[PDB]
Design a protein around this ligand. Structure first.
Ligand code: NAP
Ligand code: NAP
Lengths: 124, 93, 326, 93, 326
């Protein structure tokens, strides 16, 4: 409950950038100007990233669809962290993008589209 | 706003898919995700320049949806705006 | 000791061991295997890969090309060679005429998905074409940037020298290499004829079938194993060769050579291959392999090379009893 | 009329933006504004020939909007004309 | 006095001062600075820019190319030169073989975003390649329109003459220039060896490191300044050179030269550079600069040139005490 009163409300803005920038970073990785322990893989695109990776797992405890939007918003991360010290785990870096869906928690227009879909499965 | 927000979504979303689907290519026309953006927009809006297209299968699958989703996306906030003109036009008439 | 050597006296540096694609690529082995073989080789520093339009009706070139594109290796780090001669059933689709050398190399390039090869070879001599025509075509495809150098395969040293003098006569480009068969039971040409050409006009040797199609490996010491080349459909001629009286006589000698191998601390194939590399006149040996094990083993031939002492060599000559008359 | 007037507007408007956004280019496919016109129309109407496209970033941003605005623009006077046929068609039926 | 001179005896007119990109472009300085340096130079009439595949793993070529495209200068008003030799870690990615000269120049061209360079250089001699192969490759890339002329770098005058005679032998194109190091503490080759080649076969000199990497500037007269090349990571060798006993002995002489400079009314760098241009055999001096100030100062060397009288030159020879034995 963001807009609960204003104080517990602006706690939403601190979730916006943590996304509207978590995305910004996820894209700059693929940049050519920024690209065994190297063939797979400390580094900014790992710095400001976890700078929010645990920031997520925080409210992650502070079920439902809207919630799974934060679980999967951190799942693929600790998954590859887990072995072969020396194309799997590939299906998980591409799943980091779903993090954009975390926006629906503050985008009514977006969530509207959500039901507009399930309420149209037979159409699609 | 809604129109743009959706696009932005479909774009960042589809640009990423088409990339990790071409990544492994001696021809991939997508240097990176931010690059694909151009492709994303042009595809969703059904312009189809051609100055950038998927060569692999994964990409062409991704692209297929990108074209379809493009229609659905735009074809939502638009109708409203359509009515708003529908009105105002005849009101002051 | 030196893993890389110049092809003849050209400035092109090839690994003393290269991987071929005859019988295997597009034919006996799967593309998965092909990719595995090539990766294994490339990672081990081998930069030479030989193929031909004739192999598997062109499939071999396709597979090789596919792998290179998929692995995305830097073209400048590779040395692709291909041979031309038999490019079809039509009269005009074979030989070394200007028409076929161009059309053939262009076709192979298309299958290889490459802008060019590093060395193009005349798969065999062509008595129906004047030498001048051939040298002009080879020179043409090189100036056209479809090849970097050209070589001959199965040519007598007389024909190689003809090509060379013709080249000097018209200010064309001389061939820089000859692809000759060479193994313990086939040594006349590489040991007698070719050496003079090397010291006189710099032409080097890139030998093939170091194991005599697998005969010199020793895998036939007691019959035709299953899935062995000799057992493949279309290779009855190889089967005949092995079971013949001479085939027997040969096998009997490999048994003698095994002891040599054991003394050197290596395996028979490793010896047979290192043997081929003992003369300076040989720039590289094109290896054949139908699985990863074979290739990983054969590359060990490099470690044997330093042990091939005059003594060891003489000994081998005695066992083979076929050292060519100097 | 309205349809055309709007287009004319979006065109002259977008052709100018895409120009001053490519002006500084060793590749700019836009000799001048009057040239961009062709691009403008083709983009807004979602044809996407390709015989002219933005190469820089500014231009591709400009172009993005040009595609979007194209839809909105046309999708206003049209609906009316749609109804006018909707009627007349069944009237004389 | 004459700001523009022919490169050797070719018809190519270069400014007597050119700007290089070693250490700086793509490396020590920012691209903003790079663009500023190049604009400054271009606006001042300098039309020569040297680079190499080896510089910054190729980054220098990229930056230089970027600037040329952004400024939108007319290609016909520029003279881009680039050097080839070290193009990668792979065996086949270095040297002057036909394979590398083509692949290397083609790669550099791609980084430069240019259809061609005005002069392509063999960055150093290659003993592993026959001269004929090299001259044929250079001639090839020129007929292919990837280069306008070709030159040698760090070649003995013997090798330069070999290339030349080989060229005449096969009706190829002779090199037109040699890029030799040349400054007050390195004068043997440019003053003894090269002059004969200039008068005999028209080969000219395009010298590098006129300030001996900044040593002859005088900025090290009392230690290693901060942000100076000697202080860069990867240039310890330069630091060693400066602090060595000979390094000291050198600095001691620059002190003597300063007086000469003051008499001439210029600065030490201006003198050191004008000095290099005193002989006709030198077509141009490639300058190095890490900031606008340095470049704006160095170009002043042109005004000093007319004052280098026999007296002044002799005097300098005495101070340096190293005039090469004629
Ligand atoms: N210039 C020409 O006209 C010409 C002619 C022929 C070939 N070539 C070239 O030369 C290359 C090599 O010829 P090649 O294949 O005949 O070579 P080879 O070395 O004589 O024979 C290789 C074959 O022997 C077997 N083998 C290899 N290593 C073995 C090991 N360690 N243990 C057991 N068996 C082993 C394998 O066959 P199995 O496992 O199937 O029994 C393999 O396919 C060709 O690929 C081609 O590029 C050129
Ligand atoms: N042919 C070859 O193999 C070859 C080899 C080497 C170089 N080259 C070419 O020659 C060009 C010039 O070589 P170079 O850079 O060694 O030239 P240089 O003239 O010997 O040294 C230039 C460097 O000295 C310092 N400097 C220059 N002017 C100065 C001034 N007025 N006051 C104080 N410091 C000053 C700067 O370094 P800091 O400010 O960083 O101390 C600058 O980077 C290269 O860029 C390259 O194009 C060719």
């Amino acid at each position: 409950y963001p807009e609960s009163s204003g104080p517990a409300r602006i706690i939403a803005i601190v979730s916006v950038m943590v996304i509207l920038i978590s995305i910004v970073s996820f894209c700059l990785e693929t940049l050519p100007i920024f690209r065994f322990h190297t063939y797979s893989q400390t580094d900014p695109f790992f710095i400001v990233e976890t700078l929010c990776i645990i920031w997520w797992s925080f409210e992650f405890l502070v079920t439902n669809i809207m919630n799974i939007i934060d679980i999967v918003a951190i799942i693929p991360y600790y998954v590859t962290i887990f072995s072969n010290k020396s194309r799997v785990v590939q299906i998980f870096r591409i799943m980091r993008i779903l993090r954009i869906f975390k926006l629906s928690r503050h985008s009514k227009g977006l969530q509207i589209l959500g039901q507009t879909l399930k309420a149209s499965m037979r159409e699609l | 706003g809604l129109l743009i927000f959706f696009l932005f979504i479909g774009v960042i979303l589809f640009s990423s898919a088409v990339y990790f689907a071409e990544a492994d290519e001696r021809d991939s026309q997508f240097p990176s995700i931010p690059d694909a953006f151009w492709w994303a927009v042009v595809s969703m809006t059904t312009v189809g320049y051609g100055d950038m297209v998927p060569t692999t299968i994964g990409g062409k699958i991704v692209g297929s949806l990108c074209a379809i989703a493009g229609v659905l996306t735009i074809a939502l906030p638009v109708p409203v705006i359509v009515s708003n003109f529908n009105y105002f036009y005849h009101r002051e008439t | 000791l030196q893993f890389y050597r110049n092809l003849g006296k050209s400035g092109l540096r090839v690994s003393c061991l290269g991987l071929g694609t005859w019988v295997t690529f597009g034919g006996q082995i799967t593309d998965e295997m092909a990719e595995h073989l090539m990766t294994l080789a490339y990672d081990n520093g081998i930069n030479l890969f030989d193929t031909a339009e004739v192999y598997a009706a062109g499939k071999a070139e396709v597979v090789l090309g596919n792998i290179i594109k998929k692995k995305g290796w830097r073209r400048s780090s590779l040395v692709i060679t291909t041979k031309i001669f038999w490019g079809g059933k039509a009269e005009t689709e074979r030989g070394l005429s200007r028409k076929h050398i161009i059309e053939g190399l262009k076709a192979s390039l298309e299958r290889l998905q490459l802008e060019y090869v590093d060395v193009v070879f005349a798969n065999r001599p062509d008595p129906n074409t004047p030498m001048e025509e051939t040298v002009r075509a080879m020179t043409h495809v090189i100036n056209q940037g479809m090849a970097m150098y050209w070589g001959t395969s199965r040519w007598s040293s007389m024909e190689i020298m003809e090509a060379y003098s013709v080249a000097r006569q018209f200010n064309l480009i001389p061939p820089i290499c000859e692809q000759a068969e060479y193994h313990m039971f086939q040594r006349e040409k590489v040991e007698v004829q070719l050496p003079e050409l090397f010291h006189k006009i710099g032409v080097g040797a890139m030998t093939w079938s170091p194991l005599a199609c697998g005969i010199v490996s020793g895998k036939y010491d007691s019959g035709i194993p299953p899935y062995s080349r000799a057992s493949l459909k279309g290779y009855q001629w190889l089967k005949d060769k092995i079971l013949s009286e001479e085939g027997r006589r040969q096998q009997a000698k490999l048994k003698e050579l095994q002891a040599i191998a054991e003394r050197l601390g290596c395996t028979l194939p490793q010896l047979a291959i290192a043997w081929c590399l003992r003369n300076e006149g040989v720039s590289s040996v094109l290896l054949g392999a139908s699985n990863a094990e074979q290739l990983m083993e054969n590359i060990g031939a490099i470690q044997v090379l330093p042990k091939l002492s005059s003594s060891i060599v003489h000994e081998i000559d005695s066992i083979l009893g076929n050292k060519p008359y100097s």
